[model samples]
Every structure is written in C-alpha cells, then in structure tokens.
Target: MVSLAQVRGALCGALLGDCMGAEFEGSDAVELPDVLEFVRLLEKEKKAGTLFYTDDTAMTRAVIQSLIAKPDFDEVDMAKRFAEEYKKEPTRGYGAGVVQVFKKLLSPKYSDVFQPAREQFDGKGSYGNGGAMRVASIALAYPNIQDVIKFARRSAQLTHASPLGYNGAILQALAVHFALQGELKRDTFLEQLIGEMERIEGVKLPFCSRLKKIKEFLASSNVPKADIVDELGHGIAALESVPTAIYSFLHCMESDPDIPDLYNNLQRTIIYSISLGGDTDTIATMAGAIAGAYYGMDQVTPSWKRSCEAIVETEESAVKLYELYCKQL
Candidate 1:
C-alpha cells in the first residue's frame, strides 16, 4: 500500500539528497570521484554544519506548504504561496530568470496572473525547469491520474504558461505519480504519457514534438551512464533537466532493480550530471531526486547527510512534511 507518508518521505528525502550534493556541483570527478568522496569534501570544507538548500528545495517546500495549507489543490493559492516564499527568500540561489519573476511578484502591481502575462524568451515564454522542480507535491496530492494531469497543468500555468514549461512540469509530476503507484512498465508508461499529451488539445506543435521525442529517446537502447549527460544534456531548462533525470532513473532501474543495494548509483548519477559541466547544480539536484525516489532514504548516505550545510533544517522539514502525510493517511 502507498501511504501518504511514503510519498512525502520520498520527496523530502530527495530534497535532502539534492542539498547535500549541491556544494560539489561543479567539482571534477577526480576531485570528488563518488558520492562518499563528495561527502568527505563537504566535511573537510565545514559545509556540513550549514546544510543550505538551493532553488530545488525552496520551490519544493513551497509546493509542500501550499498543499498542506490548503488541502484542496488550488493553483491560485499555490501560486500565491510560491510568490510569498520567493519574496521571503529572494536571494535563495535561484536561476536568474526566476529571480526576476520573484522581483515582479514582490511588486504590488504584479497580479496573480503574472506567469501568463510575461514575455519570457522574447515572447516565446519559458521552458525552464522552474515549474517542474517544485511540483513533486502534485504526485502526493493527486493519486488519481485525471486529477494529477489537471492540477499539474494548472499549477504550471500559474508561473509557466508556455506549453514547454507547463508540459515539462506535467511530465515530471506524472513520473512521480507513476513511480509512487509503482506503474513504471516501460512500454505502457511511454504510451500513456504520449496519449495524455495528445489529449491536451490546442497546444503548440513544438511542445507536442518535444513530448513525442521524449518517447522516442526512451525507446532507444539504454545509453551508457558515462554518456548520458552528453547525449541528454544537463541544465536548468525544463527540456534539459526533466528528460535527463527521467532517463537517468530509467537507466539505473533497468540496470539494477536492486539499485538500493548499489549505493554507488547515487554517486554515478550525480557524477554524470556534474560531468555535463553545465548547470551542474540543477542537473545534479533533479537527478538526485529521481534516484532517491527510486531507492528511498536509506540509499542516501549518512556522511552526505552529516556534511550538509542545513542537515537539521532539511531533517526537520522532512520530518514535519512526513508527519503531515502520515496524518493525511
């Protein structure tokens, strides 16, 4: 049985892992060859005492707080909460573009429909991972497929109305929902996702093509881990991060169902992201989440946990978030 606590635990644990691995985001594999080695670096640098979270956890916490404050999934409320959190922590190591959005949100004239009104990317709107990074809450809140699809889209539209941005969030949320329900058979999962995208009528052709191409990529032979970041890319953009993380998770799961035993998978995936040498923090952050979700909390190492700059905060938030889910159950 999938208890709410398990879902929340998975999400929070993912954030914890992301925060722990972030400090070594751009360091060479030779310097910190593996996850434990990265942990050692953290300890040596005295970063372990701070446990600071990045944009990933900030947005994740926003999503969780939004859901907990309003049991019903309301996009406006969620957006408002996001705005509030961003205002409270504007210097929270966010992507530059998103930081600009938060600046607008702080203005009294910025209406609730800020996302839709934007001329992101010279009027094309953004396809950045800003929406997807924080949307793990949808998986926990909406167990039903229909509701998941609906809420994910609405939530993205609050600040990411571009089809690329919105669909990226939808895809990530769907992955989490399916994973939580253990519905990850390859062929069916790809087909179902494609079908869902097709049903969202009137979206732009480029957006549809991106989703279609994702299926094509997933259908190909599992790429070697060392080459995944090269082929799939690693950046803060939605197109860059989401599919890469998904494919990384899929590759690891395919290689070893008992990946929970291979503690190195976490290290490998993070290394792959770091090797990409671009947007290392965001890449490692999302990849870390997927790996943690697949393998659970124990797959994460105590050394990394201990070395985090904000371990106490991460643990406290994770515990509170887990407790909320338990109460829901």
Candidate 2:
C-alpha cells in the first residue's frame, strides 16, 4: 500500500538532507538556533545555485539505479554500480576506507566481491555509516520486510563487512520500510524495531541498547547535544550515527516551542541531526529518509527541493522505484 508520494519523499528527502547538510558536515556541538540559521543560509545558497549533495546522495542514487534496472537485487550488478559511480565521481567526499574498497572493486580479477571490505582496517572491517546512508532505496524497492533486511545487508557487505555495519543498514531499512507503511506512532514503531533486532543472530545488544536510548530521550525535555552524542553517538561509526539519525526523526515529531513555526517537522529533523555535529550529512540523510517517508513529499518545501543538485534525478528514480514496488505487490 505504499504511495508514489511516499517514495518520492523518501528519496528526495535523503538527497535534500545530504545536499543541505553537506555545508556543516564537520561542525562540532552546533546549537539549535545556529542550526536553524544555517538552514536559512542554505535557502539563500540554493537561490544562488550553489548547493550540492555529497557522496551520501551519489551512492544512494547508484543504489536506486541498480534496483530499478534489476529489481531482484543482483549483488554483482549492484556492487559494480557502486564501483562505477565512485569511478565516475571520485571527489564526492567518500571516506578513505570506502575508496580503498572501490579500488579493489575495479580490479579485473576482483572475483571475490566481499574480500576488499573484509580486508579493511586489517581485517576488523568497517563499522562506518557508509552502509546505512545509502540503503533507503532498498526499503522502497522491496515490499516484504524480510527482503528489505536481506538486500540491505547484502548491499552493505559490498563495502562494510562488519556485523555492526550491515546490521545498521538493516535497522535503517526497517525504519524506512515501516515508515513507508505508515507506522509512525512512537511506541509501535520502536517495538517493531526491537522485535526485529532481537531476531538478529548476533550483535543484538548494540542495536537494542541504542534504540532504548531513543526511548529514554523521547520522554525527556531539554536534553543537550553533548548528552545525545555521548548516549547514541554522532560519529561515522554505524553504531554511533544510525541510532542518532533515527532519534532525530522521532524526536522532532512534535512542535518545538524553542524553535519557530517556520521550521516544520521535516526541517526540524534535518536541522536537529546536523546539530549533533559529527557526520552531519549522513545522519541527517538517514533521518530525512524516515521523516520524508512518514510525512510524504508534501511536507518538503518546494524552495528546498529547488536548491538541491539532484532533485530531478531523485524524483525520477523515486517514481521508478514506486512503479517497481507496485509490481512486486
């Protein structure tokens, strides 16, 4: 029962988050007011035609393209697309570790697709947010939750072989999958996520623990950015960024008296995510996907959309994903 508007919102919203949040990617401990002011500046920059998305949106588009061309989720094709996209644009702010994986992917003898990722950090593999940041399209393409989990994990393993990395991707995809289905109530959404994580064979503790922190923060008032950074995380690690992104979406559901009414829930979510400071674009990108899926594209402002670099392509991909989603059902 997913709608075209929801699909567009999810994809376009992620792009918007990446495009806008790129401006403040490495900021530290940004206040809420400053976050709002930065958003205003983005609008001004957008009008002047200078706004652009980073590796987050670029990789996400690659995932959507792969899914649209091969709805059944071909691992080889998707991996190739990821490497190809990286090749086409190597300066989109991709991480060093991931760039190494891409280099291995480009090798003619790269038959073992998962080897490069497993070799990262001297075999510890990456627990970075790279996996979760690019997985929203998987949620849109697959109607079944199990398919969503499986494909998200498989796609993530191409660049992130760690359990923490792929599990974060699973959590993110599940968030979007449920959000696309209109499961917005705080408790129900969280309970479903908890239940799913409990079923994961290993590393259930980290996912469940962070999700519980979201519950704790939801009930409190005036929680500081430092506290949030300490509790959930605001770094590049999948463990740190993924739950923080989810919290950004859920925490902004209600109107904030501190912030002006001009900033809607979706804007609040993105701004709040950036306010956490580290890895701003990816966290906001993930948060924006969930918010956009739940709130629909109508919640996003036209001026904001106009400012993003890849709006047209993102919209086209969204429609295609929606069409594919319909066929599967």
Candidate 3:
C-alpha cells in the first residue's frame, strides 16, 4: 500500500526547507528566536516572489523530470537535464566543482556523462552532500530497498563520484524509504539506519560510526547544537551534512521546549535543521524530507506551503512520481 500523503509530504516539505532555510544559509549559529519569527511572519503573510529555492530544489526538479520521462533509470537522460537546467539558470548555487561538470556535459565532444564528475578535485570527485540533497524522489520512486540504494548512488554519481558523496545519497534515500513506511520508533529507526550503513560502508563504516554517535548524543540530556556540529558536521561535505540532517530528525522525534509549542514535531525538526547553522539549506531540505515522510501531510500547513515559491509544481511532480512508482505494483 503506497502512501500518497507521505509522498506529497516528503516532496513539499523538502521545498519549504530549501526556501525558508536558504534565508540563513551561511550563518555560524542561528537561534530559535529568528527561526520561529521567520515562520510566524511567513504563516501570516508571505510575499510569493521571495523564498526562491536554491540548487537543491533545481536539481531535485531535474531528477523528477528525468525519472518521470522514463520508467527506467537513464544516466544520459538525467545528466542531460541537469546540464540543461544549469544552462538555463546558472544562479542555483550548484557546487563550484559541479559547475565544471555541467560545462563538460554541455560540450559536444564529451561522450561520457560520469567522467566530468570523476575529474573534479584532482580526479577525487565531490564529497559534497549535493548528492544527498536531491535524492528523495529516487527513494519514493522505487519500492525495493536495494533498487533505492542502487539508483540513488547512480543518480548521485553523475555529479559526485566519491564514496562519501554517493553513499550519503544512499543514506538520505534510506531515511526516506524507512520513514515512508510509517510508525518508526526512535531506537528501532536508529538501529535500522546503522545496520544499513554498516552493510553499505563495510569495514570502514564512517556512516555507521556517526549513527553510533547519534545514539550517544540521544542518550545524553539536551545535547548542544555546537556539540552536534562538532561531532556530526556543520559543512557542505556529505560527512558533514547528511548525518546532521538525520540527527536533527531523530532528535526532534519529540518536542524541545526551546522552540515554540505552537509548532508540531515536523515543523520543529525543520526549524532545528536550520538552527543548527552552517549549510542550513542543505541540512534543512534533507531533514525535512525525512520528517515529511514520517509525519505525512498533516504537519505541513497549506499557508506554509503557499509561502514557498513553486510548491504547486513541486506537488505535481510528487503526484507524478507517486503514479510512476505505483505502475509496477
């Protein structure tokens, strides 16, 4: 049984996070006061023109367009869309290295789509969470977990070749996959994530260790945001941001008194994502994807949706992805 509500929730929630969180993208530390006030004003009266999403949503839209256009995964087709989208709007704040990849993809002489990404950073490729930031639709489009893992990496590999970048995409995809199933307990959720990471990362297990750290952080009372940034991450690197997004969602499974009581757990989670500061928009969108998958559509208000630009179109992509996902079943 597919949950349409969870699907829409994940997609729209991701958009809201990108737009709202983009406002505080580069801050060092953001307090709850500013976050709540931003929400409050947007809830009351938001100018539609503002809150345009960054590269995260742009690539996400491209991902969905490619997925919907073809029933199967097509690297050439997907890379084509990313290049074209980048060409159309170069201001989406794409990773600096990825801009080079886009340039390579657009050239008629280049035959290989994935080679440009491999050539970045002295051929080491990007380890940025850019891969993870745009991966939710891949999670929703496939029912099989292995398929999700497989394609999420392939999709990320177009712009990210390193294990850090691709596996982080898989981590985000797994979070959405588990959340979409509904009724997640805290420990059980963490354990499942840890187990999946252990399998994917093998002996090194960088992601598994971070999730283990999440377990430790949750055990303590009121783990400070600074500590989380110190431990989990606070930058654009996949290692820096993906687990941070996961930690925020798991941490906000219950309410925190620091934030206003008016917001639900899902809203609190997004707020917390941005409040963590340092790559706020990336973390926000990733956490919001997980939160919305768990809470479904009830936690996301229509007024809040209206505040973000292009949500109507985002919702349609969600619906279309849902339709395509159900085609097999």
Instruction: Tell me the lDDT of model 2 at 189.
Output: 89
What are the RMSDs of all candidates, in order? 4.2, 1.5, 1.2
Model 2 poorest 10 in a row by lDDT: 41-50
Q: Pick the candidate with the highest TM-score.
A: 3
Off by over 4 Å in 3: none
Which scores higher on TM-score, 1 or 3? 3
Residue-level lDDT tens digits of model 3 in 1-329: 66888889999889988988999998998987999888888887836636799999999999999999986889899999999999999988886578999999999878999999899889998999989999999988998898899999999999999899999999999999998887888778889889898889993888888888988898899688999999998799998899999999988888787887788878888899999999999999999999988898888887788888798898888889899889846
TM-score of each prediction: 0.79, 0.96, 0.98
After TM-score superposition, the amount by which residue 23's alpha carbon in candidate 2 deviates from its true location, in angstroms, is 1.1
lDDT, candidate 1, residue 297?
59
For candidate 3, the lDDT comes to 0.89
For model 2, the stretches where C-alpha displacement exceeds 4 angstroms are 44-49, 201-204
The best candidate in terms of lDDT: 3
Clashes of each: 9, 0, 0
Model 3, position 295, has a per-residue lDDT of: 90
Candidate 1, residue 322: the lDDT equals 51
